[PDB]
Design a protein around this ligand. Structure first.
Ligand code: HEM
Ligand code: HEM
Ligand SMILES: Cc1cc(N)nc(C[C@@H]2CNC[C@@H]2OCCNC[C@H](F)c2cccc(F)c2)c1
Ligand SMILES: Cc1cc(N)nc(C[C@@H]2CNC[C@@H]2OCCNC[C@H](F)c2cccc(F)c2)c1
Ligand SMILES: C[C@H](O)[C@H](O)[C@H]1CNc2nc(N)[nH]c(=O)c2N1
Ligand SMILES: C[C@H](O)[C@H](O)[C@H]1CNc2nc(N)[nH]c(=O)c2N1
Ligand SMILES: [Zn+2]
Lengths: 411, 409
């Protein structure tokens, strides 16, 4: 079965055969589409098929499919599963798996970079202190003094689901948020609940607008532990504007390293519940979402006041004017400090080229249009005009619920 | 089977039950989502269930479900289908049907308006000249000297499908497009093909940049014929900027009346293949899409240059800057000439209100996020943060392929 996608700007038509390798469900049925819904313990029985499917993919990719090395590895895994109920990935397999999970991540606009990913194998980690050290090294390697390098650090897999490794932080680097008694928030309203957990865990909060949060790390199903990332490891960029000199006096800054730490990595049926990963920012992430979302730093009004825009009617497009200036500022600031960043025009153009390459060499590229299209200037980016098929390949990254809702506190 | 939608900005969660009445298929499966794909006669016994499903929802709406008068109409329609192979809607049923097709239109951000729709019943029409008359009357009514009113004009229903009424134009009012010896395109590059079909049929093109196209109208499955809309019925707006004096020098204008004319209206299993409808513009349609799309008028480069912005690197956001100014100019010009227009902020805020009314009054509101989120400044509009469920309810508007592909002459 063949599915076609058209680009409405170019009239380029692509053929997808890769969707035929899709296993998991989308959330959609032929009666309902859930494309804009954000969120639409395994047996040996379910595990060997999954291991086999993975090892089969790995071995075809190295062109060893059917080899003796191939057949011996199947049998080896087969026997490990029957005897220990699970199995361990070889290093080569883990690397290929982590890369492919990124490749398969349909909400990620940055995937042209997928084959360049530094994998750190932290499967020998046993404690939170060990996790802390591993994550420091990741941040230092990835930051590279502003010349950012993609990386992922992989902690031990789920066993009985009672001994999970987890990073409680949703990103390794983020700013505290403090709900004030007057109902206003200080710092990042997205992080209020987590900040409150940190405090109750004994964090001494500075109570400023940009306090870097402490890591909260769970090893082996244990209660999580607080660690402060060394400040000298946390690269930050004060935000200023090339034309407007009052921009700097808004007091804004952001961290250079976007590092997702709450996702679950699945390779060959195995589940890595702690697999923090990082690349670099696309500017709209900070300038549109982090700064201008109403429920985030929400700076639109203050920027527009300073700009003396006509604010009495939405139809002056004052919000849109201030939005563009803030985004110019973010890109200018990162560039001036030599911290890696990509603008949304460049990133989407690169994604379209990646997407076409993948169709030619792989028979497809699952993509989620809802997330790929930047949150400003959508239709002046080529991804707006590009039809996409969204489906699920493994290896994969999955959202998992925040651990404070699930953790069995040991005390 | 009962589904929740969350707004991530506000935390308001709504429960959808309306989807369990959905009938048509989406294109999505459990394995593949086609949410971003633009494009994902009836026999006697196909038509009766369709009529019944409609008449049931109609009688329920006027709170006479299961009433003597309900059962009597179901009977009358049954008799009429068995004997005539189709049936005729009562005026009341047609009006309700059309308002509901709009209400069910999951791609449409302006549905807060769905109940205020003037329906022109053109089912007595029989020639193309008649179609032209009807359409000028629609154009003049809806335009209302710039105080726009929503309207639809419904021509006769499909029969054996060898006698369709069709408006060949995709919209009642649009601009011609011609390829040049130089190789670029003059006017709207999206209408090049249609403009060639008009000249083929005898239109003498002014051969300018903003030439209102003629109507090509098809009555009763006949070869289509050409008519010019009276120039004085086409309200156009010169585009200027409130601060950039040079903007007017681009020589840009756009028409005030957006009027879609290639859709198929399906009510109670009957198919109205010529049903032009019109409301009023959200500014982004013109300013973002019509003017800035690369394969449309594609004017970004020229505006950016007149603004003296840094066009050397994508990261200066020159495109983004120019885009906003173009959209300020559309909105300002329409407002100055007192022609109804809505900005994307106000439109999307009204739609959130509409969603909330529909969830509580009707149990849901089908909505296609990919179309509903404006093509600029997406996440500063409230619809970006609103989860939506997309499903197909009937009565409905459905896209039709361009008829020059169908028709034989
Ligand atoms: C190297 C530069 C990269 C860029 C510019 C980039 C860009 C992005 C952006 C803009 C998003 C949407 C983010 C959001 O809106 O919250 C995203 C999502 C995502 N990316 Fe990337 N990405 C990069 C690297 C990576 C890496 C290194 C990985 C994994 C190894 C990754 C995996 C993911 C996943 C799993 C998502 C979905 C996240 C979620 O569901 O919350 N990306 N990417
Ligand atoms: C009253 C002012 C109205 C506003 C502001 C409005 C707004 C819009 C917008 C922005 C779109 C997306 C159009 C595009 O991107 O091409 C749209 C689509 C649509 N609307 Fe409306 N609308 C209005 C009136 C109407 C009326 C009166 C009807 C039917 C009687 C209607 C039915 C539809 C349908 C069927 C679509 C999808 C069309 C397609 O598939 O091309 N709308 N609406
Ligand atoms: C509910 C829910 C589900 C889901 N899958 N995900 C979320 C995180 C949201 C997505 N939108 C904001 C926030 O996630 C913010 C973090 N995203 C950073 C991005 F993925 C990125 C960029 C560059 C490099 C890199 F490694 C990573 C929430
Ligand atoms: C391939 C295809 C499928 C489909 N359903 N539709 C199309 C028309 C495209 C969609 N997007 C731009 C263009 O259609 C432009 C016409 N849109 C006008 C809009 F619906 C509107 C606004 C305000 C009032 C009103 F009555 C109508 C093409
Ligand atoms: C409801 C909707 O799915 C939600 O707001 C999505 C829309 N698109 C997005 N796109 C990206 N990249 N990141 C997001 O958080 C979201 N949020
Ligand atoms: C491929 C994608 O579906 C296509 O470009 C859509 C995206 N969203 C849209 N949204 C609206 N309102 N109108 C459109 O024409 C489109 N085009
Ligand atoms: Zn879908």
């Amino acid at each position: 079965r063949f599915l076609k996608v058209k680009n409405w700007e170019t009239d380029v038509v692509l053929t997808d055969t890769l969707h035929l390798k899709s296993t998991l469900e989308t959330g959609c049925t032929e009666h309902i589409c859930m494309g804009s819904i954000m969120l639409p313990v395994r047996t040996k029985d379910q595990l060997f098929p999954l291991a086999k499917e993975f090892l089969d993919q790995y071995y075809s990719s190295i062109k060893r499919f059917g080899s003796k090395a191939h057949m011996d590895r199947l049998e080896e895994v087969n026997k490990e599963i029957e005897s220990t109920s699970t199995y361990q990935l070889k290093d080569t397999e883990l690397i290929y798996g982590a890369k492919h999970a990124w490749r398969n991540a349909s909400r990620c606009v940055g995937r042209i970079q997928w084959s360049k990913l530094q994998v750190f194998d932290a499967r020998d980690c046993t404690t939170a202190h060990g996790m802390f050290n591993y994550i420091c090294n990741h941040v230092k390697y990835a930051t590279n003094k502003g010349n950012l390098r993609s990386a992922i650090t992989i902690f031990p897999q789920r066993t009985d689901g009672k001994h999970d490794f987890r990073v409680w932080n949703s990103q390794l680097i983020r700013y505290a948020g403090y709900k004030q008694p007057d109902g206003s928030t200080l710092g990042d309203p997205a992080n209020v609940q987590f900040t409150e957990i940190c405090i109750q865990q004994g964090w001494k909060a500075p109570r400023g607008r940009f306090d870097v949060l402490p890591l909260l790390l769970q090893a082996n199903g244990n209660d999580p532990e607080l660690f402060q990332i060394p400040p000298e490891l946390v690269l930050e960029v004060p935000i200023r504007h090339p034309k407007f000199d009052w921009f700097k006096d808004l007091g804004l800054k952001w961290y250079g390293l976007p590092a997702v730490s709450n996702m679950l990595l699945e390779i060959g049926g195995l589940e890595f519940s702690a697999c923090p990963f990082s690349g670099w920012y696309m500017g709209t992430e900070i300038g549109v979402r982090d700064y201008c979302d109403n429920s985030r730093y929400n700076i639109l009004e203050e920027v527009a006041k300073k700009m003396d825009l006509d604010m009495r009617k939405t139809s002056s497009l004052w919000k849109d004017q201030a939005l563009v200036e803030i985004n110019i500022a973010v890109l200018y600031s990162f560039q001036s400090d030599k911290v890696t960043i990509v603008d949304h025009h460049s990133a989407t153009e690169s994604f379209i080229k990646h997407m076409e390459n993948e169709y030619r060499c792989r028979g497809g590229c699952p993509a989620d249009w809802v997330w790929i299209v930047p949150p400003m200037s959508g239709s002046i980016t080529p991804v707006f005009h590009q039809e996409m098929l969204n489906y699920r390949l493994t290896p994969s990254f999955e959202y998992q619920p925040d651990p404070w809702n699930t953790h069995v506190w040991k005390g």
